[PDB]
Amino acid sequence: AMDFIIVDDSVFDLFTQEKLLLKSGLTTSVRTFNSAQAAIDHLRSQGADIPDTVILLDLQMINGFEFTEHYGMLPEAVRARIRLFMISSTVDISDIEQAEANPHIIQLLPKPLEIPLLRELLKRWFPS
């Protein structure tokens, strides 16, 4: 039982991604945000009682590495319930290195999202 939060400035990509995630049995609750601020605002109202939550954050957006700065300010107890992933259509080796260096970014995923790739990846980070 996982919640999904998508953060993307592209309205087309936002709704499309939401559609695909719902189309699979990967999740039944998709929350969508068009801005980092609104995404951060929602997270600041959450406690450690929230379900296993996956956050899909777009790279070329505040952007991705400004979002993580505000994200790192959230209490550790709520961050522990969350697995944050970076998504992007363009992927140069410089982006990969930065995501790797960023503690909150688990992995950089390519666009469009590969559902079987992510479903397997969820086994690793949300076990049992």
Added chain:
Amino acid sequence: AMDFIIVDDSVFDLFTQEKLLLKSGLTTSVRTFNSAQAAIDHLRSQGADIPDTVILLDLQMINGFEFTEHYGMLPEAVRARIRLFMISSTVDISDIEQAEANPHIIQLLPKPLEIPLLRELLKRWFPS
């Protein structure tokens, strides 16, 4: 089953707060510290086997935002068992912003402590 740790330079406020927490069924074990050093010293001797622990830290005190620096040095495994709250009689919007920015400070609570407000807040951060 929660432990409570109060850190306040005001001896009157320290014992008074301890009294109120014991007066309610919110907790049965209240530890009180008159100094950040003694509070930090006690925490450094703890492991990840400690009960769900709430820490009430006074703002105008090392002070509050020097205590958190030493607090951030504790192992993550013991910090995960702890929910840290800032308490103060005076609350200007500048204090709120800083507490919000500080990852270890979950929320700034006003003095005197509102037990029903905190009891509800404990449901969020120490679930089940």
Added chain:
Amino acid sequence: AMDFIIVDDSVFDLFTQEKLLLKSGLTTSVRTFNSAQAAIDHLRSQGADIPDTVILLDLQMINGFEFTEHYGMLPEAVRARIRLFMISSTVDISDIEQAEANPHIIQLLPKPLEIPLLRELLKRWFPS
């Protein structure tokens, strides 16, 4: 059920330590690394589904306080499954203070490793 990871540039110390840990009933799975890079590489491939893992890191080695920098870059979900300890033959009060200040270093242990000392210490950090 714990996994043990030893990181030591000394090949003699590495295999010797591995031998002692296996000699006791403290663990049955010891992974050994002769370099911080190879140790970090292995950790970067792990998820939050890994067993309770103890990491023994040698001080005079990248060294110990460069290893922790790369270690701090790992996702918090995998770090929560790990207890990291610093080990060294020489122990001046300056080393103790730095280990104390480093959030990821739980405790500095002397060489050679005292198995009963560590076994008791594991009760604190890997409870139940």
